[PDB]
Amino acid sequence: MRSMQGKVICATNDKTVNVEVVRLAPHPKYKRRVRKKKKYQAHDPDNQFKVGDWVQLDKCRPISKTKTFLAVAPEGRQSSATRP
Amino acid sequence: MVKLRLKRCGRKQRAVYRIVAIDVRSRREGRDLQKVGFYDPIKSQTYLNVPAILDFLEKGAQPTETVYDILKRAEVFKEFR
Amino acid sequence: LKKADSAAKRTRQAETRRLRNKARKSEVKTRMRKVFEALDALKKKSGASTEELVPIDNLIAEAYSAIDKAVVKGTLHRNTAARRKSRLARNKKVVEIHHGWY
RNA sequence: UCUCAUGGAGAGUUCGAUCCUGGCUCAGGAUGAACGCUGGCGGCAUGCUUAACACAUGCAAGUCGGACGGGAAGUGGUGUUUCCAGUGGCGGACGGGUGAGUAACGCGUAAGAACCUGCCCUUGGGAGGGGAACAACAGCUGGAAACGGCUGCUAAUACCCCGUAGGCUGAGAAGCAAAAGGAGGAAUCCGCCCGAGGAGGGGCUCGCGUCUGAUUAGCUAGUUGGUGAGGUAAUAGCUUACCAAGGCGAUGAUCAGUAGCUGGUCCGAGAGGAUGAUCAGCCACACUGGGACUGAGACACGGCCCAGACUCCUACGGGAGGCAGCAGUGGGGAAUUUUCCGCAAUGGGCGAAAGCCUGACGGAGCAAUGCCGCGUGGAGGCAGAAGGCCCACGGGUCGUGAACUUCUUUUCCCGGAGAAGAAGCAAUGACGGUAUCCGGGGAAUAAGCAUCGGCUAACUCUGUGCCAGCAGCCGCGGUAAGACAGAGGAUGCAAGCGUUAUCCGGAAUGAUUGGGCGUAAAGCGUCUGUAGGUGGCUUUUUAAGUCCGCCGUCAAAUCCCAGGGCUCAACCCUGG
Ligand SMILES: [Mg+2]
Ligand SMILES: [Mg+2]
Ligand SMILES: [Mg+2]
Ligand SMILES: [Mg+2]
Ligand SMILES: [Mg+2]
Ligand SMILES: [Mg+2]
Ligand SMILES: [Mg+2]
Ligand SMILES: [Mg+2]
Ligand SMILES: [Mg+2]
Ligand SMILES: [Mg+2]
Ligand SMILES: [Mg+2]
Ligand SMILES: [Mg+2]
Ligand SMILES: [Mg+2]
Ligand SMILES: [Mg+2]
Ligand SMILES: [Mg+2]
Ligand SMILES: [Mg+2]
Ligand SMILES: [Mg+2]
Ligand SMILES: [Mg+2]
Ligand SMILES: [Mg+2]
Ligand SMILES: [Mg+2]
Ligand SMILES: [Mg+2]
Ligand SMILES: [Mg+2]
Ligand SMILES: [Mg+2]
Ligand SMILES: [Mg+2]
Ligand SMILES: [Mg+2]
Ligand SMILES: [Mg+2]
Ligand SMILES: [Mg+2]
Ligand SMILES: [Mg+2]
Ligand SMILES: [Mg+2]
């Protein structure tokens, strides 16, 4: 709700991981919810993330040019592996 | 610095002022953040809500010459200190 | 007779304050150079010695004196002086940590 | 039989005629308006949209002698005192003007962390002892002038050192850091130094929204990322060395063109479309470019340095300047104002105070530019007449209109009285003898513009003969023209009326609301399939979307409802 989730594609760089964020919002003229995409750059000093993982972002003071976020784990998920 | 003065808004040759607290370097018709009174010389009427004015004076607001006189006729200074 | 000109007066004052501030900054520049030219000489020398740190302890006082006296005047901001003094203390510990003192 | 709903109009033109389809045109409202004809007043507003073209002249930022040394005037050339070129302090980064540039944290909205902040407020502790200079000034000296040069003297809230420290650097040991006095019947206020906070202001980052073009598809190399060393008030490739090869983009990168943004303004049944004058906020620029000093704060409209173009002065060696500040000139253009009064009010800067400055602002003047309001007479006027036009020649119309008779005086003229705005004991008013009130005179001072073929309210006659000419569309005129010109009459408006230009509506004519593709314009020649879009049924999970209840915010002004005040209205104000 507050922060933005995203997929962590292109995690090749050192101490950094490119992240793809997705959101839906209604079109102002026609009122249809369109899936828009926007990328960001975050940092994981432990390098605990790799491509294929699910990651959450947080605001922080700027680390470099265009890298102004911090990668954290997700809060609310629905794994629920094999519940009755 | 914060200051308690009054701006003009009305008709030509009919002055109708309102008291307001704004920055000094801002112009006469500057962006307001709290209107704390109303006044005119012709009709000589005044509302002059005291709870808002004391909030600024505690924080270093300096009235002008006439606003000091308006507040002087009121008993706000005796309760201010 | 000639009249006044307050704008020209600010030009006259600025040149005087410029020479004061220009000289006051260059003092901070040269006194640092005595330190780093020594630390570069003390590092390449393989002979460890505690007595050789006392002249450096004399220059660091001359540096902090020139810097702190400048903060009193209108040249440098207080956070600026902390960065210059920290650069001296930081680079000093490099010789301490590179060698066996730590 | 409740309540909601105050809101959607069409017409002409293709055909011999009809039903459709589809364009063109008109009736509405608005304007920073312009032109044409005409023109009485008052109130509130508005007034270079083009050449961010170039500018004569005057003003637009100064202030403190209760910071300091000197100098001048006056006096009884004696005391008090008045004035200031210079040193020093604060303000000259506010206010004012202009949208050239800018397609992006610039703006709007909603959040954040790694920072600064003079003046104001609050608060904890201090100000001890010494010294050296530049100005002014005095002498000499170079210049046409602007401005200097040399030799010596001097004060300070100006300069320097020592001493002290609840602060700074550092893992620590240790090292470093300040200050100014002034006025005074002496209580004792204005200030100075260090440190911690409050408010306001400013800097930085981020989410969302933010023009057109694919006959611009590849762009970037300090470019994306790190480390180390730097640097900034502070985070940051902000800078640099090395290393890694990433970063942006067909949901439109890059390139090109256009443009200040917003609150809002206009139109619209609404959805939404167009737009960004005045007022208010942010940003940006200051002859064209570049750079830095000063300061708490600038890369500074009326500050400095350099280059370039232009203008002016010159004794030809050398100098001065930047109205996109007020007013005003030239030029451009269809077109937009006095080279005015005043700091009385409001607001701003300096000062302990008295007071000084304030082309901001408050007022006046010009213009029918717009909106609103009131006049250019009311009542009566039997019968009859002159006159214009028309006629079936009997009459009809202009026409109760006029004449005439009484009544009244907004307005007009004359003569008096006369403010509020002023806050502060009194005095202190640019506007201003202004608004306003009383008295006298007397219908006396005041209506024009377009249209009259259909859309579209309003008709005949004369003249002209596809001529002269009208026209928004259809189209009228070729000898009886309701369509041209004149006349009379009528209609619609009214100190305005019409023309032109620009935007919206009508236009469902880009059809989300709200259109269509058999033959009227419109289904790729066909199929397979990537991205993308959508997706059967049943029970659970979560609560992103969605719905409900609260909190904060989207400034004020404007719009909407109510209330009040200007004699009403426009308009102004209060509240929501
Ligand atoms: Mg026909
Ligand atoms: Mg212009
Ligand atoms: Mg003083
Ligand atoms: Mg003086
Ligand atoms: Mg200052
Ligand atoms: Mg000392
Ligand atoms: Mg770069
Ligand atoms: Mg880094
Ligand atoms: Mg432009
Ligand atoms: Mg419509
Ligand atoms: Mg110019
Ligand atoms: Mg300036
Ligand atoms: Mg100028
Ligand atoms: Mg001008
Ligand atoms: Mg004044
Ligand atoms: Mg004043
Ligand atoms: Mg003056
Ligand atoms: Mg006209
Ligand atoms: Mg009559
Ligand atoms: Mg008709
Ligand atoms: Mg005609
Ligand atoms: Mg005829
Ligand atoms: Mg005719
Ligand atoms: Mg439409
Ligand atoms: Mg159709
Ligand atoms: Mg056909
Ligand atoms: Mg066809
Ligand atoms: Mg297929
Ligand atoms: Mg509002």
UniProtKB/Swiss-Prot annotation, chain A:
Signal peptide: none annotated. GO terms for molecular function: rRNA binding; structural constituent of ribosome. Transmembrane segments: none annotated. It comes from the Eukaryota. GO terms for biological process: translation. It is found in: Plastid, Chloroplast. The keyword Chloroplast applies. Keywords: Chloroplast, Plastid, Ribonucleoprotein, Ribosomal protein, RNA-binding, rRNA-binding, Transit peptide. Disulfide bonds: none annotated. GO terms for cellular component: chloroplast; ribonucleoprotein complex; ribosome. Component of the chloroplast small ribosomal subunit (SSU). Mature 70S chloroplast ribosomes of higher plants consist of a small (30S) and a large (50S) subunit. The 30S small subunit contains 1 molecule of ribosomal RNA (16S rRNA) and 24 different proteins. The 50S large subunit contains 3 rRNA molecules (23S, 5S and 4.5S rRNA) and 33 different proteins. Component of the chloroplast ribosome (chloro-ribosome), a dedicated translation machinery responsible for the synthesis of chloroplast genome-encoded proteins, including proteins of the transcription and translation machinery and components of the photosynthetic apparatus. Belongs to the universal ribosomal protein uS17 family. This is Small ribosomal subunit protein uS17c.
Swiss-Prot record, chain B:
GO terms for biological process: mitochondrial translation. Its main location: plastid. The keyword Cell cycle does not apply. GO terms for cellular component: chloroplast; mitochondrion; small ribosomal subunit. Pfam families: Ribosomal_S16 (PF00886). GO terms for molecular function: structural constituent of ribosome. PROSITE patterns: RIBOSOMAL_S16. The keyword DNA damage does not apply. PANTHER family: 30S RIBOSOMAL PROTEIN S16, SMALL RIBOSOMAL SUBUNIT PROTEIN BS16M. NCBIfam families: S16. Belongs to the bacterial ribosomal protein bS16 family. This is Small ribosomal subunit protein bS16c. The lineage of its organism: Eukaryota, Viridiplantae, Streptophyta, Embryophyta, Tracheophyta.
Curated annotation (Swiss-Prot), chain C:
Keywords: Chloroplast, Plastid, Ribonucleoprotein, Ribosomal protein, RNA-binding, rRNA-binding, Transit peptide. It is found in: Plastid, Chloroplast. GO terms for molecular function: small ribosomal subunit rRNA binding; structural constituent of ribosome. The keyword Nucleus does not apply. GO terms for cellular component: chloroplast; small ribosomal subunit. GO terms for biological process: translation. Residues 7-27 are annotated as: Disordered. Belongs to the bacterial ribosomal protein bS20 family. Component of the chloroplast ribosome (chloro-ribosome), a dedicated translation machinery responsible for the synthesis of chloroplast genome-encoded proteins, including proteins of the transcription and translation machinery and components of the photosynthetic apparatus. Component of the chloroplast small ribosomal subunit (SSU). Mature 70S chloroplast ribosomes of higher plants consist of a small (30S) and a large (50S) subunit. The 30S small subunit contains 1 molecule of ribosomal RNA (16S rRNA) and 24 different proteins. The 50S large subunit contains 3 rRNA molecules (23S, 5S and 4.5S rRNA) and 33 different proteins. This is Small ribosomal subunit protein bS20c. It comes from Spinacia oleracea. The lineage of its organism: Eukaryota, Viridiplantae, Streptophyta, Embryophyta, Tracheophyta. The gene is RPS20.
